[PDB]
A paper describes a structure:
We aimed to understand the structural mechanisms underlying CR9’s broad neutralization activity. Using cryo-electron microscopy, we obtained high-resolution structure of the complex of the pre-fusion-stabilized SARS-CoV-2 BA.5 spike ectodomain trimer and the CR9 Fab fragment. The overall resolution of the asymmetric reconstruction is 3.6 Å. Similar to prior studies, the complex adopts one conformational state with three-up RBD. Cryo-EM analysis confirmed full occupancy, with each RBD of the homo-trimeric spike bound by a single Fab.
Author numbering:
A (entry chain J): 1 to 107
B (entry chain A): 352 to 549
C (entry chain G): 2 to 116
Write the structure that this text describes.
């Protein structure tokens, strides 16, 4: 259903810098049902935001993530060494579902 | 929304003159013989639904909106009509009147409505008080945005029901009225009187 | 708050495999829960939804082969794979992803499907 684009191929992580991760939706899609979650393969993943307004728990919530239309992004001001995992953005309608291959975070 | 019809007559010609409806899913009796058959009571369930949920609103399909909020019985003949009223009401910040329930503890039988104020429990602990972690009140507001395509537009849906009873029927009106020419040898059926003359 | 999956292994295509999804603390049996498969070298992809009520959602590829049922005594889900295929070599994910947050995902039993 929904088409999603997440760029680039590889990241340029260096701790102590501001980073911008953006994912683009299909047709002016809303964000109150959009969910970001962290994911590192091998174990249980971590959640980031629900409803794109208030972030999920277990995070200090310094990442500012929002958007409108087909333009959704998150800006992280302070980087931590625990962020070495790939982040996904999804949207749910209850009758249609979508997923996206995220961008690998390394140097 | 849910409604019913009293003793009168409902012509669908003026309904067909209103607007080109989106659904026209009259899967029961044929639309041509709607005026030929009539019943004692009519239920009018005229409400509004999101555009992406017009697909599963049929009795043959089910979903979260169907099984928890409003369900139509498959073993029942019905005629539904729906039209797009997205431009009729639009709010830039989001329509806050179109909140819908997320979850109820048991699945809903078709043709019942239930409103309450209780908290869904997500653990072996009471939810009499207010909580926000593993004890959630089921709340879901769409927040309709005018800057969206066809998927999330408010399509107002009118559901029309019909059933037989031991009473005489109301809404079909077989009244046949002609022009009544004044000077000719013509046939007539005045109140069931089969006769000819001038 | 934490979930465990029990019963996984390695079986040939064309057989039936039973797995148990049991969580502790959260009464997950009365929630919108979902089933996810994750192939190695492939991103996460939606497979199935099952509700607290009897509403079955399935993907096009899995069709009616997948079976899910909920136990009433505990927060235990019994799920059965029938007539397995070589395209289903994937790790299993069981979760209770709802429309509020869809949070607290599970590590999941890791399996591989081969003849």
């Amino acid at each position: 259903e929904l088409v999603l684009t997440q760029s680039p191929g590889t990241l340029s992580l260096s701790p102590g810098e501001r980073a911008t991760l953006s994912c683009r939706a299909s047709l002016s899609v809303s964000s109150n049902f959009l969910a970001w979650y962290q994911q590192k393969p091998g174990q249980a993943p971590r959640l980031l935001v629900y409803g794109a307004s208030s972030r999920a728990t277990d995070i200090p919530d310094r990442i500012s993530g929002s958007g409108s239309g087909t333009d959704f992004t998150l800006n992280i001001s302070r980087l931590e060494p625990e962020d070495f995992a790939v982040y996904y953005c999804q949207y749910s309608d209850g009758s249609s579902w979508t997923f996206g291959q995220g961008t690998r975070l390394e140097i | 929304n849910r409604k019913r019809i009293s003793n009168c007559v409902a012509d669908y010609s003026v309904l067909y003159n209103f607007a080109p409806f989106f659904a026209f899913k009259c899967y029961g009796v044929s639309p041509t013989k709607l005026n030929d058959l009539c019943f004692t009571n009519v239920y009018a369930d005229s409400f509004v639904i999101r555009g992406n949920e017009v697909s599963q609103i049929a009795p043959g399909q089910t979903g979260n909106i169907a099984d928890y909020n409003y369900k139509l019985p498959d073993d029942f003949t019905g005629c539904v009509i729906a039209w797009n009223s997205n431009k009729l009401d639009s709010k830039v910040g989001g329509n806050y009147n179109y909140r819908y329930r997320l979850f109820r503890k048991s699945n809903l039988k078709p043709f019942e409505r239930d409103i309450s104020t209780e908290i869904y429990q997500a653990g072996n602990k009471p939810c009499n008080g207010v909580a926000g972690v593993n004890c959630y009140f089921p709340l879901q507001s769409y927040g309709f945005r005018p800057t969206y395509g066809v998927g999330h537009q408010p399509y107002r849906v009118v559901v029309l029901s019909f059933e037989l009873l031991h009473a005489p029927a109301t809404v079909c009106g077989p009244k046949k009225s002609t022009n009544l020419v004044k000077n000719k040898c013509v046939n007539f059926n005045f109140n069931g009187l089969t006769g000819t003359g001038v | 708050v934490q979930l465990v999956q029990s019963g996984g292994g390695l079986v040939q295509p064309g057989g039936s495999l039973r797995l148990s999804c049991a969580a502790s603390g959260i009464t997950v049996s009365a929630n919108y829960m979902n089933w996810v498969r994750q192939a190695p070298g492939k991103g996460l992809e939606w497979v199935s939804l099952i509700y607290a009520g009897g509403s079955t959602f399935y993907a096009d590829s899995v069709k009616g082969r997948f079976t899910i049922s909920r136990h009433n005594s505990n927060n235990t889900l019994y799920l059965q794979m029938n007539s397995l295929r070589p395209e289903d070599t994937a790790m299993y994910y069981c979760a209770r992803d709802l429309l509020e947050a869809g949070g607290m995902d599970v590590w999941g039993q890791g399996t591989a499907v081969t003849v």
